[PDB]
């Protein structure tokens with residue numbers, strides 16, 4: 001589908017077409033302290049696509065919430081994006097639990113399909129704008145998931161840390177007919193002054209997860225988030 005729900009926020013319209021180059025897609029960010037959304041290419045940002053491996057964010061929370069993940073661990077599985085680990089979590093979660101969570105979280109079209117790898121170029125779809133809203137709300141507003149689980153997720157998503165910022169996120173790469181079809185990078189950044197949630201989606205050109213990550217870093221840098 002398309003995500004049609006209006007954004008009742010005075011959001012800033014960006015032009016990062018040059019950074020995207022030959023690639024088509026969108027970029028969305030949200031500043032906690034300013035309570036502000038920033039969007040490049042709002043039209044594309046509302047189109048729903050398969051989340052691919054970015055859905056491992058939520059499978060991890062479900063695994064922790066249901067004590068499937070206890071005490072190859074979460075960090076190695078997330079950082080190397082080990083598929084069997086997360087397919088097994090999904091297999092061990094009752095459907096109605098998942099359906100209930102996706103409804104409370106407002107995750108995209110909520111379509112679980114055959115309830116087997118439904119997040120990998122299949123039934124479940126979410127827009128780039130929704131990726132940011134949903135992730136921000138799950139971490140900052142949702143009180144069903146515990147802070148312990150949230151901290152374990154964050155530790156598994158940590159990519160960069162220095163005196164200026166901490167960068168967290170997860171890539172996704174959809175493959176169709178032997179080629180990139182769908183590129184994602186979803187995450188958040190903690191600086192000394194603010195916290196930003198963000199996501200880049202690539203629909204065409206060279207739409208790989210790594211390309212989405214690289215474009216994400218260039219945009220955040222250019223916007224001064226990494227200063």
Ligand SMILES: *C(=O)N1C[C@H](NOS(=O)(=O)O)CC[C@H]1C(N)=O
Pocket residue numbers: 051052053054080081082083120170171172173174175209210
């Ligand atoms: C997630 O999209 N996948 C699992 C694995 N990791 O993806 S990532 O490298 O972009 O983070 C490999 C690619 C992809 C898949 N369709 O298998």
